[PDB]
């Protein structure tokens, strides 16, 4: 299999387009990356019309020789790391599913499915409710729910890409000495980032984009998102990651997350209106008024 997003349930062009690794290695958010991808597809010998067809209805001859075409061409563009081995499960005259696609469908089912304290309580209740929707999809009898999860995953990844290009083009990322800050205050569809998993998706997109950047640094990142209804920011701290294909000389116990201790230290000393109640200690909910001072304290906190 390949490090491609939902290959067997979408086109080949879509799989190459919405991939974190390909986007990091080719910078598809601007025009140059799209032109480079078109040049690659032209060189490989696959017509642009054929690469946009559904996987089931794709040409048999092209599908048969995909491995050789990948092996002989992927090295020129630095994408030789997309080839790997995985696990594929098939049940009768139904169709093949890979483990990666299954976990993305499950995550999509988790994310979307189905006076401020009550507002937060209803959101948490819906998040609890989504658990049974994800639970039902593990049974072989309920395949329509798995298909629904696949569609939801496609839509969610499209939204993440759309937000990420806006973040990257306007230079919203601010490089402080200790960490890198990104606060999303205005824009469309900020109601998708009230869920921690969607913000983790966007953070994984940004970290993947930064890891392959020629700039050599390992600073942690802070991602903040506003909810108008609750007037609260949801703030998450994300650890840096080494490049995927880098050697094992640096390999060790991975970089440690130090945001929990810093958040507890700042919360204890000052009477900030923060909520640290999630299982993940790196995700907090801070009132709108306290965001700008609190972060300043974090700048002097250290351990980051």
């Amino acid at each position: 299999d390949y490090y491609l997003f939902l290959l067997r349930h979408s086109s080949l062009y879509d799989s190459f387009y919405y991939s974190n690794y390909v986007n990091a290695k080719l910078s598809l958010w601007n025009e140059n990356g799209k032109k480079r991808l078109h040049k690659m597809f032209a060189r490989m010998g696959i017509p642009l019309s054929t690469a946009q067809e559904t996987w089931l209805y794709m040409d048999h001859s092209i599908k048969r020789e995909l491995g050789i075409i990948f092996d002989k061409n992927l090295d020129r563009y630095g994408l030789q790391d997309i080839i790997r081995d995985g696990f594929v499960r098939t049940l009768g005259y139904r169709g093949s599913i890979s483990a990666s696609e299954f976990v993305e469908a499950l995550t999509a089912l988790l994310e979307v499915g189905n006076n401020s304290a009550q507002k937060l309580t209803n959101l948490r209740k819906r998040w609890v409710s989504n658990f049974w929707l994800s639970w039902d999809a593990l049974d072989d009898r309920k395949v329509e729910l798995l298909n629904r999860g696949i569609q939801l995953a496609q839509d969610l990844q499209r939204a993440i890409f759309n937000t990420g290009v806006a973040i990257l083009e306007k230079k919203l990322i601010k490089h402080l000495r200790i960490y890198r800050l990104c606060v999303l205050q205005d824009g469309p569809d900020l109601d998708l980032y009230r869920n921690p998993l969607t913000l983790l998706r966007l953070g994984n997109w940004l970290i993947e984009c930064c890891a392959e950047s020629e700039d050599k640094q390992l600073l942690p990142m802070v991602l903040a998102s506003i909810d108008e209804n609750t007037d609260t920011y949801l703030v998450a701290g994300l650890t840096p990651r080494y490049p995927r294909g880098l050697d094992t000389i640096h390999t060790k116990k991975p970089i440690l997350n130090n945001f929990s201790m810093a958040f507890q230290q700042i919360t204890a000393e000052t009477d900030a209106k923060v909520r640290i109640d999630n299982f993940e200690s790196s995700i907090i909910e801070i009132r709108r008024e306290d965001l700008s001072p609190f972060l300043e304290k974090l700048t002097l906190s250290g351990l980051l």
């Binding site: 032109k35 032209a42 060189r43 017509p47 806006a166 083009e169």
Partner: protein, 660 residues
């Protein structure tokens, strides 16, 4: 083997036989490949390598080769191509495909053959001056498309089968104008029934068109001449019925029984097989420039666009470069630039469509260079149509219904607004026009569509067009002591559809007159018509452009085309309260004292102008500067159309919004 010196001497008393000899055709191919690989221009960059690189990216099937390049070096091959096109083109296509398979190996799975499109042939003929000496040679002819047959599949490798011997005949290349005639069998040794060998065959796209002579070329008062042109694959549907085109092709002859029967002499029919197509509809810049499309860009040109797009004050230079020889009238130039770049159309949930084009009106005194500005807009725009006054009708700016001469069914034909889809329609002397003809554009100005219900045809067309109109006030001159509604005859329904209105007044001022006269006299002095010399001409023509144009016009045309084609800015973060307050104030100050209709339709024009100013910078997001500039433009367009009594108060009242 032979040498380029040895191709000069000719044998067989015919050039075609000399070219088709096996030893000559091996030197020709090598020389053509060396020309393709090793040619460099003045700057030192190989152009055909870049063209081949772009070909695979775009999944193109054709290559464009300039005749001047192949004539400057290897002139013998240029002469051979000029005299004998058919045999040279077969070899040149093969060498082109071989050169293409050096950048994109395995490209044969996309396209199996590469076609070559010749450009900039030196000699241009008219249809009236074609004679028999031009038979079987490459020619360049201008004309006007009249009628188009439509696309049908045509056989490429024709096969035959004979039953009594069961023989299958080898593939035959069809002439595309003469039916393949076979009567002898290699095996049957006698006449036998021949089948078409059903299935297992290769087809091509075929189309036919008729070119009349252009009215400008035809001598005044004489009948035009027409000819037939065959368009093969990759060239179908490029030309449209009504456009004016230039075709490079091969002039051929064929035997027709009816022509011999009627005339009474053994005369032959002629037809042109098209090789290259260039559009000339609205183009007056055909005097210079090289290529098949002057609105297309290369990679280095796109890089230069992105380089000059990040300079501060690009909008100011773009505005200053509009109609450079006209002095003053900067608001008109700003409106023209905003209309040229345009806005962004929108569709909300697939049920609510919002227009994204800016319309401009110019109402002014005589002798203020409005028509010259319209002509400049016609020249710069990619697609432009021109009309004036009583010379246009209700169905001449719209779709008409005609009986097809062949099919004999009622059919729809195009018009001025349809010929300028995604373009500009210019209407000079817009007030000296019938009301029935003027009211035909009401649907196209806002809904951007045309609906016809005539003679059993019930259809809706699409006209995404922008209108820049010029008019004269009542009495020929503007009374500044009167409101707008009494200086024009147009009513509210047509005045609301315009985005920007420019009132041009001529006033007595000694210093202004002196400056205008000095500028005009200097312009007349400049325009007086009295290494390689052909590049000395270019450098001298650039020196004159240096003074009054911050950027060259040829660069600006491609800049505008690229900006319109690629960029689509959005409005994520912006100040809603300022726009709401401005709209409410404008609505209040209209009924109280004013005669300029303001509705919800004028709220969206500010956003459209903001998106246009964002496009000017090649940015994907609208900033605060662009929105403020749009608000300032809209406010200045409203204040200066008032009476002299209340203008000073209105300007002061509206001055808080435009602080910058």
């Amino acid at each position: 083997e032979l040498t380029l010196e040895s191709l000069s001497n000719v044998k067989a008393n015919s050039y075609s036989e000399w070219i088709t000899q096996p030893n000559v055709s091996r030197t020709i191919a090598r020389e053509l490949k060396s020309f393709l690989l090793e040619y460099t221009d003045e700057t030192g960059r190989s152009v055909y390598g870049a063209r081949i690189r772009t070909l695979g990216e775009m999944n193109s099937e054709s290559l464009e080769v300039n005749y001047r390049h192949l004539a400057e070096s290897k002139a013998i091959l240029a002469l051979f191509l000029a005299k004998c096109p058919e045999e040279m083109l077969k070899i040149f296509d093969l060498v082109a495909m071989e050169a293409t398979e050096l950048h994109y190996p395995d490209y044969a799975r996309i396209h199996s053959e590469i076609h070559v499109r010749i450009s900039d042939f030196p000699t241009i003929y008219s249809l009236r001056e074609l004679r028999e000496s031009n038979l079987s040679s490459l020619v360049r002819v201008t004309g006007v498309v009249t009628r188009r047959t439509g696309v049908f599949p045509q056989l490429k490798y024709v096969k035959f089968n004979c039953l009594k011997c069961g023989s299958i005949l080898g593939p035959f290349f069809q002439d595309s104008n003469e039916e393949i005639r076979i009567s002898f069998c290699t095996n049957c040794k006698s006449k036998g029934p021949f089948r078409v060998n059903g299935e297992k065959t290769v087809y091509r796209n075929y189309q036919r068109v008729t070119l009349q002579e252009a009215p400008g070329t035809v001598p005044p008062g004489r009948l035009p001449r027409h000819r037939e042109v065959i368009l093969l694959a990759d060239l179908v549907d490029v030309s449209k019925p009504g456009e004016e085109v230039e075709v490079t092709g091969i002039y051929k002859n064929n035997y027709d029984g009816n022509l011999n029967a009627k005339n009474g002499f053994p005369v032959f029919a002629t037809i042109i097989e098209a090789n290259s197509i260039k559009r000339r509809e609205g183009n007056t810049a055909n005097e210079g420039e090289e290529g098949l499309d002057v609105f297309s860009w290369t990679e280095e040109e796109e890089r230069e666009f992105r380089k000059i797009s990040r300079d501060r004050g690009i909008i100011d230079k773009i505005i200053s470069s509009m109609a450079p020889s006209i002095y003053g009238h900067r608001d008109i130039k700003t409106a023209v630039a905003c209309s040229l770049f345009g806005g962004v159309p929108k569709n909300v949930n697939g049920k609510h469509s919002i227009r994204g084009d800016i319309n401009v009106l110019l109402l002014g005194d005589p002798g203020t260079a409005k028509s010259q500005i319209l002509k400049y807009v016609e020249k710069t725009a990619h697609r432009a149509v021109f009309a004036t006054g009583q010379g246009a009708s209700a169905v001449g700016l719209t779709a008409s219904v005609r009986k097809d001469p062949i099919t004999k069914e009622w059919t729809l034909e195009g018009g001025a607004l349809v010929l300028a889809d995604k373009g500009v329609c210019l209407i000079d002397e817009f007030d000296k026009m019938n009301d029935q003809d003027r009211t035909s554009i009401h649907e196209a100005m806002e809904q951007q569509s045309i609906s016809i219900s005539k003679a059993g045809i019930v259809t809706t067309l699409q006209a995404r067009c922008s209108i820049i109109a010029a008019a004269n006030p009542n009495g020929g001159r503007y009374n500044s002591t009167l409101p707008l509604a009494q200086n024009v005859s147009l009513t509210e329904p047509i005045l609301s559809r315009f985005d920007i209105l420019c009132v041009v007044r001529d006033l007595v001022d000694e210093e202004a007159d002196e400056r205008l006269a000095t500028f005009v006299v200097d312009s007349h002095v400049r325009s007086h018509p009295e290494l390689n010399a052909r590049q000395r001409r270019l450098q001298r023509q650039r020196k004159k452009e240096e003074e009054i144009s911050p950027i060259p016009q040829e660069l600006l045309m491609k800049y505008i085309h690229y900006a319109r084609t690629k960029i689509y800015p959005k409005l994520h973060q912006m100040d809603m309260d300022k726009v709401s307050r401005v709209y409410a104030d404008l609505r209040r100050e209209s009924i109280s004292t004013g005669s300029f209709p303001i509705t919800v339709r004028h709220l969206e024009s500010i956003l459209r102008i903001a998106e246009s100013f964002a496009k000017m910078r090649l940015s994907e997001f609208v900033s605060s500067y662009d929105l403020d500039r749009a608000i300032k433009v809209v406010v200045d367009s409203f204040v200066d159309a008032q009476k002299v009594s209340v203008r000073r108060q209105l300007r002061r009242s509206f001055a808080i919004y435009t602080l910058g």
